[PDB]
Design a protein around this nucleic acid. Structure first.
Lengths: 131, 84, 164, 136, 195, 88
RNA sequence: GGUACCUAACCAGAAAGCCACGGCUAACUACGUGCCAGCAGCCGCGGUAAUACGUAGGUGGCAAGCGUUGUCCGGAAUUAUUGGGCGUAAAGGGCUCGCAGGCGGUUUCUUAAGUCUGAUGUGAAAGCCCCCGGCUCAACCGGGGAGGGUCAUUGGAAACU
RNA sequence: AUUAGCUAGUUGGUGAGGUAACGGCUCACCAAGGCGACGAUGCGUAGCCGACCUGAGAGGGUGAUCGGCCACACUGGGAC
């Protein structure tokens, strides 16, 4: 029934963040896995590490909260929703916040973040922004 | 040299009730102009057959030709796979 | 935090509203006035004051505004990024603009931004035309703004790669 | 959800009805038919010139014309000014203009037209009311 | 008529003098000397636009057209506007001290001849091209108002050179940020026309 | 028959023509096949700019020039090398 | 067509009007008028002290133009994908079962229809945009660019549909 | 869509005629086919585009002159 995992994952992270739960659990999938890796790279979270089982495993993520109990991440937006997939040419890749945020884009040569995708001239399915 | 290649289409049979001729549907489809959501659309044709090889349900490949008859413009190339 | 009064602040009376109360002896009128006060370096904040006499009602309002003040980031005399003010059906959009456009906003919004001292900025008012709610929404947005340096330190990164 | 409701049900826009339904209709004789046109003014013959009262409880006695336009349409009209020479059976030119205080009249009798004399003894707004420069 | 009235209406002399402000600097008309309410937040920039247009003596359509040209020009719309207004040759001949008044500049350049790399020029938008020596030909070389203007010394801005013995000046590269806004608080016109 | 043609453009008193190749039937300012230069009569020294590769293939395949374009081709010697092209 | 232009001589003499002035919106005073005469795009004004009616002076906007009318777009986030809502303001079908249709759990190979990106062929000229040149700036007129396909052939990539 | 069925040389075939050609383009014979919810049929309306106006944008309106294509020449039909 559950339409697409990315919406569930983003909204679960947002729900955990607005009340500042230091722990969080997500059912494990490949795409969600590298997305967590991407947020770890960009420093929007504290750390992510995995646990495996017979039912698509689980991934657990530890959210950063800055030096003084302030939101490291202030929002998340899915834009390539099921029923309306949005695809961006390489040149029109969005500069979210003209730099501050990040947009994650699936590309013909892997799933990349905004600036590096623009740097190496790749387009494709742009899935979400991070605020 | 080699001449220009006429277009080649892919589709499914939707009628075979007429001798030496075969009607096909092609699922070619677009996205809405001002919304940009993929939407399904069907185009049907009449194609020419020589011995009624194709039957209802078959999947056939198609190439256009000169006008052979009114409303008929296409030839049967081959029956790539046959129905149940 | 509260910003002390060691500053030079101007006041721009945006509106005085006639206000009435119903009592046995007919009607009882007062005067409610809101004013936005703040220096041009970047300190802003509104106030309100109700009384029966316009000048000293304005006095009340300016005292309240002085008591309640707020700061704002000022990257290049312009906001750093996008923001939407979201206070009680008051929808205001703000966008940074090039260094020659100027201030482009509605009346109350223009008063607030110009008093803040932002030189180059554009905006839009999408919610109700109510002035006080305009002020509350835009100031909520202005508070929500974020400098780049604190964002870098929060991420554990630096400005050069954040802008890169 | 909503996207399919749009793709099939669509976005039906509202329609701005013409504010001057008489100005935008035309007619021809050897073909007996009413045409659709955009026109800024029309002429006609006044079938009655009179004066009646408005709707607001605060009143003033206003003048009006009843005119048959070229396109065979019937309508009342308002005559702005002080005094006039607008007798019954006169070829008068009409322009689009509302008068809220008077109910039913959608059009203004322009002045300086074929048989409407400009209001006399006026200095400003002379362009309106069809009056020449008073002195040479 | 318009000179004194406009100057004291705006409250600023279009050239800068004690006169037009000496004893009746308030406003024209009978209600002038009374109490002047603070101009609306539309009135302020309307007054600024009026200040600039009257001080530079230009028609409204001209002014708007030059504004769009400046906006299309690169740099900063706030001042490129005034740079073009200064490039207007009438102001050039004035700032070269060839006349007392911009009215004189207009009148002279209209029917009088100002040979600047061209036989005649009436349209004000031209310039004296840097790097060429062509000067006012030998019919108005001796003229009363010219002699008065040259003898009454006045500040030729540093982006303009001039020698009265042959009364010719070479328009230098461009005008600076100082003469940009001597007293006019620009960047009000930008949103006044954005309106 | 195709021809090398002088198509008019400009103002009410300042004619400015383009040397163009078009058929004899197409109107003076209408459709054409290709533009191959420009000509200015009112310039104090008369001015012309001609291309002579993809413009010269037209002379190769056959195209009568009008009189003025012909003598301008003579002025630039393009029709000359077109003449030597036969014996060459 | 002795037209464009250049050369001289005569004269401040032949050449400024249109609209608004309560708020929206920049500009206010005196007189007459007394629900009359009238004003108007909205709010509305005028029933003897009218900055809202008509005049007069002044001010304000613009200028060989200025107001009115009529048509279209914005303001209208007021058909909202970009960019809206449905408890009480308009709005959840009385409820359910379900054809077509729209959507689709996790891993793993493969296919490239969607997808992203090169190459080529066109998307006339003249227009809008950029850069230059010329009509005594330009109006305009040139010269060179750029943009303009939910475009045809062909190559490359396989993360996602 | 307050326009649900339209079509019966229209749908397919075999032969024969027929601008320069392929063809129900026209005949003869045989056969029940064709098109419709992805809007057929019918009613109303309009020349189409480069482009023009507005709008920052999506978008919304226009199709004058300048250019291209199309149809018409008092109204219908006909061929040389």
């Amino acid at each position: 029934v559950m339409t697409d995992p990315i919406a569930d994952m983003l909204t679960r992270i947002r729900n955990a963040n607005m009340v500042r739960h230091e722990k969080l659990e997500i059912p494990a999938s490949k795409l969600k896995r590298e997305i967590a890796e991407i947020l770890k790279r960009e420093g929007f979270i504290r750390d992510v590490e995995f646990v495996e089982d017979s039912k698509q495993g689980i991934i657990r993520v530890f959210l950063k909260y800055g030096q003084n109990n302030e939101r490291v991440i202030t929002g998340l937006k899915r834009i390539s929703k099921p029923g309306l997939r949005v695809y961006a040419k390489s040149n029109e890749v969005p500069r979210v916040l003209n730099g501050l945020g990040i947009a994650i884009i699936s590309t013909s040569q892997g799933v990349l973040t905004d600036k590096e995708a623009r740097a190496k001239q790749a387009g494709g399915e742009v899935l979400a922004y991070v605020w | 040299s080699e001449r220009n290649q006429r277009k080649v289409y892919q589709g499914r049979v939707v009628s075979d009730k007429m001798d030496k001729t075969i009607t096909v549907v092609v699922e070619t489809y677009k996205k809405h102009t001002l919304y940009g959501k993929r939407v399904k659309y069907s185009k049907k044709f009449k194609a020419h057959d020589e011995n009624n090889q194709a039957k209802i349900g078959d999947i056939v490949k198609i190439m256009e030709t000169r006008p052979l008859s009114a409303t008929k413009r296409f030839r049967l190339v081959e029956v790539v796979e046959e129905a149940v | 935090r509260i910003d002390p009064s060691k500053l030079e602040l101007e006041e721009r009376l945006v509106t005085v509203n006639r206000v009435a109360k119903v009592v046995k002896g007919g009607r009882r009128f007062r005067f409610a006035a809101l004013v936005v006060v703040g220096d041009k370096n970047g300190h802003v904040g509104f106030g309100t004051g109700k009384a029966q006499e316009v000048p000293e009602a304005i006095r009340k309002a300016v005292e309240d505004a002085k008591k309640n003040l707020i700061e704002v980031p000022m990257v290049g005399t312009t906001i750093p990024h996008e923001i939407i003010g979201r206070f009680g059906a008051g929808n205001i959009l703000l966008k940074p603009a090039s260094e020659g456009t100027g201030v482009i906003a509605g009346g109350p919004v223009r008063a607030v931004l110009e008093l803040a001292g932002v030189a180059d900025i554009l905006s839009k008012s999408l919610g109700s035309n109510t002035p006080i709610n305009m002020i509350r929404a835009t100031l909520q947005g202005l508070s929500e703004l974020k400098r780049a340096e604190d964002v870098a330190k929060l991420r554990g990164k630096s400005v050069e790669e954040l802008l890169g | 959800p909503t996207i399919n409701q749009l793709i099939r049900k669509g976005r039906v826009s509202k329609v701005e009805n013409s504010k001057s339904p008489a100005l935008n209709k035309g007619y021809n004789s050897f073909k007996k038919e009413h045409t659709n046109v955009s026109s800024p003014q029309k002429r006609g013959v006044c079938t009655r010139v009179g004066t009646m009262t408005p709707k607001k409880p605060n009143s003033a006695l206003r003048k009006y014309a009843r005119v048959r336009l070229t396109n065979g349409i019937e309508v009342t009209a308002y005559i702005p000014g002080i005094g006039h020479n607008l007798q019954e059976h006169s070829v008068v030119l009409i322009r689009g203009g509302r008068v809220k205080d008077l109910p039913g009249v959608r059009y203004h009798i322009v002045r300086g037209a074929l048989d409407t004399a400009g209001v006399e003894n006026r200095a400003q707004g002379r362009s309106k009311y069809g009056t020449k420069k008073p002195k040479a | 008529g318009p000179s004194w009235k406009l100057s004291r209406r705006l409250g600023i002399s279009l050239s800068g003098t004690g006169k037009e402000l000496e004893k009746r600097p308030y406003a024209p008309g009978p209600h002038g000397p009374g109490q002047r309410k603070k101009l609306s937040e539309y009135g302020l920039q309307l007054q600024e636009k009026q200040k600039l247009r009257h001080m530079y003596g230009v028609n409204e359509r001209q002014f708007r057209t030059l504004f769009d040209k400046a906006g299309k020009l690169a740099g900063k719309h706030g001042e490129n506007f005034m740079i073009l207004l200064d490039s207007r040759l009438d102001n050039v001949v004035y700032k070269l001290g060839l006349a007392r008044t911009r009215r004189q500049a207009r009148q002279l350049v209209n029917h009088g001849h100002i040979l600047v790399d061209g036989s005649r020029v009436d349209i004000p938008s031209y310039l004296v091209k840097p790097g060429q020596t062509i000067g006012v030909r030998e019919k108005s070389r001796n003229l009363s108002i010219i002699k008065e203007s040259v003898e009454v010394n006045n500040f030729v801005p540093e982006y303009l050179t001039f020698d009265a013995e042959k009364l010719e000046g070479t328009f230098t590269r461009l005008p600076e940020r100082s003469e940009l806004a001597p007293e006019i608080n620009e960047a009000l016109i930008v949103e006044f026309y954005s309106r | 028959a195709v021809k090398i043609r002088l198509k008019r453009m400009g103002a009410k008193k300042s004619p400015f023509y383009r040397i163009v190749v078009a058929d004899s039937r197409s109107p003076r300012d209408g459709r054409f096949i290709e533009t191959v230069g420009t000509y200015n009569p009112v310039a104090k020294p008369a001015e012309v700019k001609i291309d002579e590769e993809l413009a010269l293939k037209w002379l190769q395949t056959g195209a009568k020039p009008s009189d003025t374009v012909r003598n301008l081709f003579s002025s630039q010697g393009i029709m000359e090398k077109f003449h030597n092209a036969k014996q060459g």
